[PDB]
Amino acid sequence: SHMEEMIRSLQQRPEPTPEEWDLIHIATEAHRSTNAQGSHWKQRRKFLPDDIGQSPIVSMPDGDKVDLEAFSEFTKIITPAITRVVDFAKKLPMFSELPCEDQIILLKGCCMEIMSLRAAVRYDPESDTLTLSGEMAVKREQLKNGGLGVVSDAIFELGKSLSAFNLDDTEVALLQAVLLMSTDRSGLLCVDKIEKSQEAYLLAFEHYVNHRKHNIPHFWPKLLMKVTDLRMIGACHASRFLHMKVECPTELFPPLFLEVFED
Numbered sequence: 001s002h003m004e005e006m007i008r009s010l011q012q013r014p015e016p017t018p019e020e021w022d023l024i025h026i027a028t029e030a031h032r033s034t035n036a037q038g039s040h041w042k043q044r045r046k047f048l049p050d051d052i053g054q055s056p057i058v059s060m061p062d063g064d065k066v067d068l069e070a071f072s073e074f075t076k077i078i079t080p081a082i083t084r085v086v087d088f089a090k091k092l093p094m095f096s097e098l099p100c101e102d103q104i105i106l107l108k109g110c111c112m113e114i115m116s117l118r119a120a121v122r123y124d125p126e127s128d129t130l131t132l133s134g135e136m137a138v139k140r141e142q143l144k145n146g147g148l149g150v151v152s153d154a155i156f157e158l159g160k161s162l163s164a165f166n167l168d169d170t171e172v173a174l175l176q177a178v179l180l181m182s183t184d185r186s187g188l189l190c191v192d193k194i195e196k197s198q199e200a201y202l203l204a205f206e207h208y209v210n211h212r213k214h215n216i217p218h219f220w221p222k223l224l225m226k227v228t229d230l231r232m233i234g235a236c237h238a239s240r241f242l243h244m245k246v247e248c249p250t251e252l253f254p255p256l257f258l259e260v261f262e263d
């Protein structure tokens with residue numbers, strides 16, 4: 001119609017449908033309500049003491065040793081972080097309608113990818129830090145030494161690169177939904193349904209990116225490459241986590257940390 005054309009005049013690319021907007025809204029709010037500190041993180045966060053995370057002392061196969069005190073500081077806050085990822089997922093109808101067993105497999109599969117993304121989007125260029133759970137600002141050396149090794153470097157590089165993308169809450173939430181609804185896991189019951197849901201999220205996300213009209217070119221494929229980086233981060237972490245368990249006693253690992261990162 002005449003009105004439709006007028007308002008779509010500076011549009012070419014497909015916008016989200018009404019159905020996709022509903023999808024977008026629900027996921028955005030699911031993320032906002034489960035993202036620690038929300039909009040206030042920069043003010044409310046405290047730096048991890050400079051004297052912590054400078055003392056790698058426990059051996060690892062790749063030679064990047066672990067600072068036990070720093071590892072402990074990190075693991076002490078990881079349970080509420082994992083919990084919020086579970087909280088986010090439960091708020092998406094296409095996730096909550098899956099069998100309980102599939103939900104668990106999907107959460108285990110994407111948990112590090114999502115937490116890494118949530119750290120990365122809170123990279124602060126001025127202090128050169130990530131913020132963990134909206135409350136703990138950490139330097140590259142600290143996060144490296146406290147257990148992550150080269151995974152820290154990868155997350156910092158992702159965070160630095162994401163600054164220019166200027167992602168909003170919706171884009172972060174849709175990335176999380178896409179990571180969550182991956183069928184690259186063993187033992188799933190409802191593979192076709194999960195794939196259909198990821199396809200629905202991907203198309204809604206592509207259309208939202210169109211709606212946003214970012215100033216950087218090739219935004220959509222660029223964002224997809226970032227998903228691939230997040231996958232590599234998740235994989236490197238899973239491998240390193242196996243080594244952590246070989247080296248250190250169970251008592252240093254919070255129960256949920258152990259459960260979610262099971263091989």
Ligand SMILES: N[C@@H](Cc1cc(I)c(Oc2ccc(O)c(I)c2)c(I)c1)C(=O)O
Nearest residue numbers: 074078081115116118119132133134147
């Ligand atoms: N910042 C995120 C939560 C988040 C919390 C923590 I502790 C993180 O560090 C990790 C992760 C895995 C590990 O094995 C180790 I050792 C340290 C990261 I990366 C992210 C959020 O806002 O939800």
Ligand SMILES: N[C@@H](Cc1cc(I)c(Oc2ccc(O)c(I)c2)c(I)c1)C(=O)O
Nearest residue numbers: 178181182183184198223224225227228
């Ligand atoms: N179900 C799929 C959906 C999906 C499919 C494709 I093709 C993607 O682009 C890729 C993938 C791997 C690469 O090496 C490169 I370069 C680009 C992405 I990002 C996601 C998934 O969850 O990955």
